[PDB]
Amino acid sequence: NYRIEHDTMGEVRVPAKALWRAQTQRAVENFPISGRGLERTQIRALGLLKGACAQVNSDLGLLAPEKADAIIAAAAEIADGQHDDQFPIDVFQTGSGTSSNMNTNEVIASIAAKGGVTLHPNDDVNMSQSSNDTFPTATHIAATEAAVAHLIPALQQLHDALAAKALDWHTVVKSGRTHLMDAVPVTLGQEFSGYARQIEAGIERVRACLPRLGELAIGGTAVGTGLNAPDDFGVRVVAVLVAQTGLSELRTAANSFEAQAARDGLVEASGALRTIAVSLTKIANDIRWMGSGPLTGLAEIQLPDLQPGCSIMPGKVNPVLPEAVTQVAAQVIGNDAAIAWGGANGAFELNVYIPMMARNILESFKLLTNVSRLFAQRCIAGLTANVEHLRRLAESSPSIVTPLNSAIGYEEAAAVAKQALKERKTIRQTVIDRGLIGDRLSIEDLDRRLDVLAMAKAEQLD
């Protein structure tokens, strides 16, 4: 069963029970590309914004209070998620998001009609607005909320898990590795202090993008001039959004033309997510290499077992959380390339890559948030160190000859490391055998300099 709806292009047959109308139905037929529509977070931001716009139009005496109350009530239902099934339009729609904007207007008009209030989707629900300021506004609201309320707390949780290991393993000595080769001693805690700093720097990177990510185009309307909107429409709508979201990062854009002709704030934010993906790849790769083997690998640490590793090789348990992290990082890198591509190709008064840029940035925020919490809770928290094996590794490195450089010189330390590795003998034995004990180096000096934990120079903790 179908019903007739109309727009300025003509009559359109719409499924009888759908709350959307003519323009949403045309967009359903024009863009069957990915088979996926807007996400819960996107629909929420659109509903929140539509309600705020109706409230301001009402306050300024431009829209009758009964009509504004119907929009506010319908928009609140949309924001809470009661009508996500009424947003069937593909992500790969017209680049301004006109179709999803009209989707919100039409669904509100249908909800209001069930309450006995007649609203025109353009004249009433879209009063003082354009898709060109509302769709990037709803995108930037969703991106700002994803950064502040979800990603930053998830990264803080991962940072705290890494920092707790850095403290726990502060004096657990092991051999450092540079170029994958035997280096001088480090502690496991020192390496984890490095990982924790990468995540802390990741939080700093997200926070540094917020002054421009939180800029909203609302009030600029069609081309940024604010035509058909009151001069204070933008600041009044943002006032409501800040009060209702608690997001102090939300503000009217510094320049109304830049805020619509470009989506540079999304490209900037993706760069921060991409740097986090780069940091997470290093952390996850080191952790699975430390857990490698056990018998054929490094066997430095034990990762918590999360599931049987293999359908054919029995007993084997795999580093599945570092694998999910490195695959998420690859996705964030890909999404980042798509966002920049869209960002660069605006023309004149409008960048028409917004639905695609919105899909990718919001997905990158989601993946990084979810995988960071799982990595912290299901992997980092439960790691255990193989203390004895790590100590043996530290002591086996021929590079432990290095602190003798000031006493015997680099060339003689290299002759010591050579005469030892070839004869499968210790650095200590070789130093004595080459008659190096004397004025330049006593026996007490040698054993003090060769102590692997002292060689790691771990900071003294109170």
Place this chain on the structure above:
Amino acid sequence: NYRIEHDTMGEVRVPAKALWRAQTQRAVENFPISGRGLERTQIRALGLLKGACAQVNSDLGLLAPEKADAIIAAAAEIADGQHDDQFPIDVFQTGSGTSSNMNTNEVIASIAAKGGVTLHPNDDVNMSQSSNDTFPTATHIAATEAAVAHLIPALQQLHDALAAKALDWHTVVKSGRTHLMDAVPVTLGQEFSGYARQIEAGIERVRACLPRLGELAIGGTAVGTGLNAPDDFGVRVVAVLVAQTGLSELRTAANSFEAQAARDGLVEASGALRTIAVSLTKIANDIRWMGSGPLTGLAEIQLPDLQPGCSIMPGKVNPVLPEAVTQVAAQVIGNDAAIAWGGANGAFELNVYIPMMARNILESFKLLTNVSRLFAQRCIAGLTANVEHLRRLAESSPSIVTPLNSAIGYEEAAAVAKQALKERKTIRQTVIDRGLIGDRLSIEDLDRRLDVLAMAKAEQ
């Protein structure tokens, strides 16, 4: 509400009506990352492959016919999308696809149990297999099927629509543009013949990757050695798959270690899709620039109206199909970067980025297929040329002085073009008014050489 299942790690509470068992349930709790599981096409390939493996194990007398028949029947139901709700594992799972492989084994065991047959998910359903050869095999089957049966016909449809316009507009003269500036004449048909060749070359690029995209790891098992499988398991399974799908491009990998340690065939195929995204961006951008305005743009052609353009500016109609094409192309570029990143980071006997690489390559195939057909049907087929305006544009270009180079020289031809633009005069009148008619250039020569359609040199 829940039932107990177990694996070698212990007991797991599973939803009472779920057809999956212990290992799928662990994966549900370990990877809640994207909130999306395998696509219909991926589940089909896994079901298809599981059935083919049971058939070969049965043919070789390794699996009792009653057990093999139960796997074949259950796997066919999975392949035919009767149990997609029984595959809840995230894309961002363990990099070998072990979890989705065990998901298929467990769901087949549960289906077989309803038919009165007891199957062990490892010993029976996974006999002669590993996730390490089965999951990349199912990925390469799905990718090969997407290329041959869906993308190539969609690109052929777009090519034919572009070639139809090249023929219809063969003598529709217009001004060429280089660097966005006034150039010599072209026909609108010649431009469309360029677009048609880009799509034809795109088909050639997809076809050229098929010998390596169609390579399957099946038979290599855990590390590529084929341990716990018959020596001819791979060749026998590939023969069953080819007959069951009609997909002749499927083949056993040339090297069983390369086929599991790497996913280079996916990286190669993504490069072809990325080149198609690059070609489509040029075609879609030119088409929306040709349709620009009408009054403030180039207004060369009219795109079919597909929907009201704007919620605030009434009457305005936008080039929505070229916008869908250029956004899809951006996504394919991004997906391509993710595929290469995963492809480079294999280690020793296994590349563990397969679920992520599979997601991206299959999505790129889907988006390009669907948008190419929509672009051909809802945009290219219905384009109309503004023949009058195009003619005025061709004749207005000062670069139409170019065929006079052999008669008056480049330097004098430049002086003519500058003066004609400055005095808002024709090239013809500027040539005469500069006193250039004489022994080197007769008036008949001038009139002959300035004909814009003849200047486009359209093939007879």
Place this chain on the structure above:
Amino acid sequence: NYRIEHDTMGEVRVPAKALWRAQTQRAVENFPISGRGLERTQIRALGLLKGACAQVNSDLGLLAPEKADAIIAAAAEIADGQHDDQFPIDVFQTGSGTSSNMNTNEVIASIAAKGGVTLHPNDDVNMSQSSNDTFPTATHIAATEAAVAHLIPALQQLHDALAAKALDWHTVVKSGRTHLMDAVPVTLGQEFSGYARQIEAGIERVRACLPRLGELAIGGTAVGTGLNAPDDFGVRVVAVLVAQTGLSELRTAANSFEAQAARDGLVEASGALRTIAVSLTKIANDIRWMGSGPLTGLAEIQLPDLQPGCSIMPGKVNPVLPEAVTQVAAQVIGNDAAIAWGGANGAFELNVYIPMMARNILESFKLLTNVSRLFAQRCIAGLTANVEHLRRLAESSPSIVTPLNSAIGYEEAAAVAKQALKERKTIRQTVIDRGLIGDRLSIEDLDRRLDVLAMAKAEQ
């Protein structure tokens, strides 16, 4: 002619006159890959750092004043560029930059020898150091200097040129374009204020990355533990670098392990350069589209003529500066992908992609700096507006019906716009012809609403 030099691996034949020694010569034979060595800016940072390290070793009484004075004098010669021909090692060397570190140590030892001072390249010139902290320190010094002293002033110059045009063309009305289609009026000044803000935001993005770009690994030595260096070596060297360069952004890293195991500050900085490339592409594309034609394009503005446009089409002048800008932006995007790839692939205590990451980030800084100044001086400064053509474009847009929405409604405004375009009539006459003048709209109100400059709502 050659001479014999030695290292712990053995004898090496070195060109007789070369100031480098055995380890540089081995690196010349091991890495003939790109055929390009370190840039002037990289050799300066290495020379500056080596001198600062010798000064601190001297201040702490670890190095004899005669030896320290010889290193300081030789390092100052390297810093000034007298010896760039003594750095022949390829960019694509060992990933820590060990070879270029030993190149600096060996060349300083050879220069000091000419002055009668014997220095061991390891024991003296490299005292308290590693390549693992010095090579990323010299990279981060060069990158910080490129950002603060060169790119930010170049972007400020471009911003000021764009802002000057935004002011000069504040009331130069034209038609806005959305989706490349006829939109409501804007001023050329308003568009240029948008471009100005993109560059201003670009400066903010570079400034926001400086707290982490300026972090130096110096003092961490081999693995970040500071082994074989005094405990205050890093803080003393940084203070000397700050006093000598005036770059207050140079600071000791917050974590000595993160500062060597990763190059995340370079990845972060590249992201800011990549965003600037994205902004510059939009600005340059709009400018060449505004200058397009003239007769077959938009012909909105005139770009200064910089060179003859075409070897075959006489008279034609091309937008060469916007083309230089968009090609630089493409390079910065590519360099950005190479930097991130290297950045992700560190292992344990060291990221061994530093020479490649250094090449790409420093090149992106250089290209953006040089093309931004050329774009501001040779293109933006000299632009002229075609004021009458721009006014006719604003008045011709059917979307000028938009401010009537509140009086006649969106649906009627769409019927007005469509009828106006069909009958090739003005919006004003179509409103009167449809009998819309009455209680909801007076002729006085209509004429006020249709004024294109008033419609652009330019700020007072």
Place this chain on the structure above:
Amino acid sequence: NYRIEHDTMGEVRVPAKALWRAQTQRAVENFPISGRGLERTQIRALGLLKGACAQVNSDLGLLAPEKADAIIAAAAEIADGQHDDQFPIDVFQTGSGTSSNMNTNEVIASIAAKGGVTLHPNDDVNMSQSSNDTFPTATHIAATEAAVAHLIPALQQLHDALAAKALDWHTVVKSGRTHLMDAVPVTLGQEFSGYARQIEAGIERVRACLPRLGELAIGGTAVGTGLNAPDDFGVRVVAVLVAQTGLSELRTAANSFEAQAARDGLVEASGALRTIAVSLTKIANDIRWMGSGPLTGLAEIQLPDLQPGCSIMPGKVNPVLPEAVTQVAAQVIGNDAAIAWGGANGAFELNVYIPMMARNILESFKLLTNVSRLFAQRCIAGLTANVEHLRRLAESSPSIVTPLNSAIGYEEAAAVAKQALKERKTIRQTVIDRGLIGDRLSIEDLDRRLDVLAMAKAEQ
């Protein structure tokens, strides 16, 4: 000292001794961006093409033999490398390469003038040509030559070195690793057979792009219509280029508009180079991990020592060739992103990103060629295997319980692997201790199944 030269824009002061003239000098002032001009290979292809064009113009009686002979002689000097110092224009010039085309025309006219032959750079040296067909033609000649004559032989050399190790180490048993964890046995030779296949597939990928990489735009002139050129100019010039280079891969483009409006063949070729970078990353990473330690790593193989590893840690030797390979791969990925970005942004009759695309594709060919030969000669050829350590690693893997699956079942095999790892006992003794010897498994069958070399199933 300077001299005056002129073009259609006016008079230009040119350095007295420079062989270039007015347009090259304007380009020197307009584009000081990267500070690097065209490469030796690019200037060679431009010289070769200019000579071939003069020969064809002479053959068709369009150019006086004295003038054609002077161009052919001068173009041969340019192609030979005698005048690379006469090409000062930056890579980041006008996107068509107009400046470098005029650079070639002007330098040829100056060389010819020394023998008393007057040639007009446009009317004579550029007869029947445009920069729009010659600059992409010279780019595609250089790219085709780099692929056929340099990269493919370098990859063949690497393939042969990898295949030689696959043969030598055919029965050198080791433990396989999947997910970096203990897997079933493989041989070192089997892994090298996987590496050899990745390079062999890389050669196949380069060969598959040659039908489109070798397509030349020559003859299409300004916009692809062939205006001001003979109808067979393209086919005649290509015939000369094939005879002089011996490159049968050089062909006239299938469509003259596609060949100039787009550079899709460069994007396609870069995708093959990018796949090779992906393959090389896996191979180089496995090799440095196998050579890791020795005492704190895997210590599976020994890489040849090429230089002292470290300025601070004495004795240490690093895997510098795998590091140069992985950094080259990162650069090829970055260059690939820049090529695709330029490729997608053509407009109408011309893609104006050619100098940037040319720089990146030719650099990717060069880096891959040079690093592949160095990797084969200085690393792969000299590798040695630690045979006894490798066999002990194979025997130590608990996953050697895997071939018992058919006898005791997966669940019981897991119980064996658990007990053995927990009690530090062998798989063999755990099987006996669990009382599994009986009807399903004899002691003789157990010992045959646990033989690690037999478990690797190396081909006879």
